Amino acid sequence: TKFYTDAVEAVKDIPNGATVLVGGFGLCGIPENLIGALLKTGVKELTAVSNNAGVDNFGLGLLLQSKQIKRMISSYVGENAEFERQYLAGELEVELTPQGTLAERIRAGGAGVPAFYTSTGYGTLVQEGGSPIKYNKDGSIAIASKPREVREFNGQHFILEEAIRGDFALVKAWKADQAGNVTFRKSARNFNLPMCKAAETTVVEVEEIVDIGSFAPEDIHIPKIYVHRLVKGEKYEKRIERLSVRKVRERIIKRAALEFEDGMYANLGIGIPLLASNFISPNMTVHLQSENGILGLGPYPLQNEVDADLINAGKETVTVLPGASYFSSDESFAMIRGGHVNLTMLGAMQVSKYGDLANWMIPGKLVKGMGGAMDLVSSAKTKVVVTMEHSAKGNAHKIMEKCTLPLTGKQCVNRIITEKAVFDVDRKKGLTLIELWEGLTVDDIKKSTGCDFAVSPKLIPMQQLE
Amino acid sequence: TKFYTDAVEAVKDIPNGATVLVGGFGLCGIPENLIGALLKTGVKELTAVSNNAGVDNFGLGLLLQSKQIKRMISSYVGENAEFERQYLAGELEVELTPQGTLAERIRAGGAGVPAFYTSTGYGTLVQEGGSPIKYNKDGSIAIASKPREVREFNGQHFILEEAIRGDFALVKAWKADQAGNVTFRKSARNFNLPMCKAAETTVVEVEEIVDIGSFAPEDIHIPKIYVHRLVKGEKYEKRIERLSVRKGDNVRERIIKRAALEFEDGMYANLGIGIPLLASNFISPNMTVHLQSENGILGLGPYPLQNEVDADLINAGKETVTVLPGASYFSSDESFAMIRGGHVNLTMLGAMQVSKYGDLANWMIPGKLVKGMGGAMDLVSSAKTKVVVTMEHSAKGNAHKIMEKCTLPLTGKQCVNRIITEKAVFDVDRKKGLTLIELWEGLTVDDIKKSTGCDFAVSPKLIPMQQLE
Ligand SMILES: [Cl-]
The missing domain is CATH 3.40.1080.10 (Glutaconate Coenzyme A-transferase)
Structure with a gap:
């Protein structure tokens, strides 16, 4: 694990057109400093594999705002009007992928499995094809999704899904030790863990860097073998998308x-x-x-x-x-x-x-x-x-x-x-x-x-x- | 999670001919009390999915000694002469399976994946078939392994492997809380974790039962959803197969x-x-x-x-x-x-x-x-x-x-x-x-x-x- 003090230095070599996995569920466990560094570098035409598109003005939405993303591979758009606009306008490509399938395909991509079967999406546009990936300006459809091969196992129908692997992975984590081992806090783990294994170069940002020995070895969530570049995040805004309080x-x-x-x-x-x-x-x-x-x-x-x-x-x-x-x-x-x-x-x-x-x-x-x-x-x-x-x-x-x-x-x-x-x-x-x-x-x-x-x-x- | 005080009560309903996943790497992380309970019940004709066969006189070897196992699905036989004997003699069926493939197939079986592809075993008897599963009394091959389908992805050849799922899983773990959450100690985790997810009924034995809240929630290795039956093990012999300690030609x-x-x-x-x-x-x-x-x-x-x-x-x-x-x-x-x-x-x-x-x-x-x-x-x-x-x-x-x-x-x-x-x-x-x-x-x-x-x-x-x- 190579340690960095500057986040821009950690991501400056990402090429245009690269496929980049981005950690996070909504705004929970997003790599906000690495996304921030991508604004500065200005790398463009990215295929961003991320569960959601953040919000309009934070998380992955910032890179949609700067038009640095060509294609999104995601499960849920949510509360990002800019996302919806660009997609409907014909400016952004979007492969809507079932969340669990997205997760398993990223895993496969890090675990040496090229393809696997799942019943998720059978009898739907995922299996049959024709899911809009890109729209034309005029409103007609530019790119549609291709069908997935169907196969029967034990009296039931499944579809074949292929591994997803990135050129880079941008990952948020709670703590890292000086050896490069990493842990996550509460539900901020989500997609960060699998994505950390499924890319050629993985870049992890952490809130704190602790001593070697601080973690119980059983409780290391991502071993150092997966962590290629580590940076301590400068700013953490602790942003909350939907406050839901009780009295x-x-x-x-x-x-x-x-x-x-x-x-x-x-x-x-x-x-x-x-x-x-x-x-x-x-x-x-x-x-x-x-x-x-x-x-x-x-x-x-x-x-x-x-x-x-x-x-x-x-x-x-x-x-x-x-x-x-x-x-x-x-x-x-x-x-x-x-x-x-x-x-x-x-x-x-x-x-x-x-x-x-x-x-x-x-x-x-x-x-x-x-x-x-x-x-x-x-x-x-x-x-x-x-x-x-x-x-x-x-x-x-x-x-x-x-x-x-x-x-x-x-x-x-x-x-x-x-x-x-x-x-x-x-x-x-x-x-x-x-x-x-x-x-x-x-x-x-x-x-x-x-x-x-x-x-x-x-x-x-x-x-x-x- | 249903708690038990008696291990035999936890496993008494396993039918003859059942497929049973058994945790362990050698003698590290083996469910010795559950295996011990299976000796008492005397359930037989089992298909035992286990990485190894323990040793001659301990672990899964005990059930080979009592002839309660019909088929073994395993990656390495190791230092069990009784296994080797029964296998070579034509008394025991054995599917020799690549360790990582065994691990991924167990996982697939718990994760809703019926099959997947891997390059492991391509160009070998696993892929091409003919691996001896059973020998005859005369020493000929009674049952041979079937081939695996080959398919090319990105300029490389892979074989299709199917999920493994058990009727029961016998699992060893370090600690469990009163809610049923479980953790493992050091390298005793091995196959116990995936196997805990890949069976209809999972039975876990633990060395200690702690109160709820004892675990940091991030550091729970197997969540309670996977643990169906939990028992505190009566006896733990801490057996070591090969003692190797610190103080060859040219x-x-x-x-x-x-x-x-x-x-x-x-x-x-x-x-x-x-x-x-x-x-x-x-x-x-x-x-x-x-x-x-x-x-x-x-x-x-x-x-x-x-x-x-x-x-x-x-x-x-x-x-x-x-x-x-x-x-x-x-x-x-x-x-x-x-x-x-x-x-x-x-x-x-x-x-x-x-x-x-x-x-x-x-x-x-x-x-x-x-x-x-x-x-x-x-x-x-x-x-x-x-x-x-x-x-x-x-x-x-x-x-x-x-x-x-x-x-x-x-x-x-x-x-x-x-x-x-x-x-x-x-x-x-x-x-x-x-x-x-x-x-x-x-x-x-x-x-x-x-x-x-x-x-x-x-x-x-x-x-x-x-x-x-
Ligand atoms: Cl979502």
Whole structure:
């Protein structure tokens, strides 16, 4: 590990057109001093592999502001209007990649694996191709994504994904010893760990440099072999994107809250699912998983508990309960993709008769990326429960024969909770109405549902947890 | 995580014919109480996925002794005569699997990846098939290994490997908190970490149970989500297979002293048993060389003084070792991500045979040496890592070891970059072949020609062979 005192000196040899991996989840664990040094060097035409695009005026967005990035390989755009503008305008190329796939491909790229199989993205634009990579000025499409090869293993369909390797990696970490060993703090680890292994030259910035021997050798997160250039960061602004402090929808939330069991491992999506966790009994123990690499999510912090290094999947500041753990992004999606999480509960725009899901794209309106949504529904072992309003504007169908919006996954939903009904979903037999809201009838549900359904002989009135 | 006080209660529901992953590198990090419970239950016909077979009378060897294992999926047999016997006799089925491939397949099995590609085992019996899985009573092959599909990526050949997943995993760990989170001590981590993620039911035994909050959350090695059943182990014998402690002819010494010139300052190296590891003694104190061990250590130091000895800290040869300041420990899957990814600068190992273009044979002598390949096939798999072979120039009866084509089973194809012998030093190219770059004093190019089974170019800057004293 070569030590540097000046960050510009550490990155001055990056060529134009280089592929650069950039650590960070939102603004959590971003290499802000190295990004700052790239503004000064002015290197351009970069293919930046990064999970998100930061915000409009910070993180990776700064390099979009200076037009130094040609292509983005990312999972979620988020709250970067400049990102969205440049992409829609035809100025920026963007490969929207499932977050777990992005993580595993970076890992493969550092672990000598050229390609591997995953069910994430099967039956979607990732697999079929045609995902817009570049737009023309006129509004038509310039570059579209190529299909991924499909292959069946053990009665199930998977797609082939190729390793991602960088010319450079720009990495943020908490501490480094004088030998070059590195550690990360809380959820600031995310993509920084795998990216540190998947590039020809890895440049790491750290908040503190400690003595050799300071780390327990078991607790070194990235061994020195992976760290090629090390710099102590001059300025750390501890920026927080979304402060979240503590001091008919309600119907869906209270029914969703009945999905939680004692000792359950759950990943809850933004909105209704996460709000349902408030109604969990104190006597019930539910461990909440976060895809950015946390197990054991707690409530939002009090003012004094706030931390830039600890955010949830929605980029909101959070806390952790006792017995929580932190891990890398590759590992978080190994967790998710392996079916280790008992319940995934997320919102939806559309569900089909056999459990196809659409919840990430509305063409020419919502193109922020899929995030970890496609990995979260990929396992058959994990119970996927959808929470949504029954019908759309003009009483248009959301539950239907076939989805009209782009798919997050095929035959992946196990249960649908709405304000009117609760449905069990089967991949072969279709929908079964198992709970019905009081005052409504089976005929009311039929004319709010775009496909037919069986009725359970033990149909009960819909439950609520108060 | 369900806590148990009795180990037999934790494992009593394992069915006959089950596939069971078993943690451990040799006798380092083995689940000895769970293995002990399996003796009592008497479950049989198991397919045991384990890196090694322990020893004759301990670890996984105990279950071989009781004939409870039908098939072994392993990388290295080692010092277990009973295994070798049962395997050769036709009583035991054995899939010899490259250690890093075994590690990555276990990982894939826990991470939702059904298959993936690797160059490890290409051009060998792993890829081409025909590796003996079962022998007949007459000594013929009853079951042979099937071929692996080959595919080219970026101008290079790789083989497809499928995920390994267990019905059960038997795992040894250092400490667990009351929440079920787990940690490992030193090199006892090895295969225990990945195996904890790749089974339907994972059963972990630990030396100590601490309270929740004892671990820094960043430093939890296996989060509770992976730990299904936890037991505090009753007895820990701290067994050491090979005690090696600190207080060889001139021809070997010659190879060692030239091998020692391969080390550079700031180099990352993985050194094999024998000559390569001995060459590390000759490294200058002013030179910093970080030694990597495939069982999951970076920063190997010398052998321990009597009081420094530790059952949890051994090298790839199963010998007790120490670590230098700034060392780190990691899982097996991670160690071979390291190796397979070309992160180690120099791999230096012994060989039985090297070919003109760098094919290597150093793991099998049919009907004589069938202990498995260990991590040897992964160690030569990367093009980024300089592979340097250290060996005697010729064999018994002045038979060739450097030759046109290897006659022994291959560790890898076109994977050796340099060959150091007591007579010569050769640069090896995959396209152009051998080039004599150093020549031992007193010998001539003609002497080398009649000790070498293929032709070779001579360097115009051929120097006398170097020695570091
Ligand atoms: Cl995201």
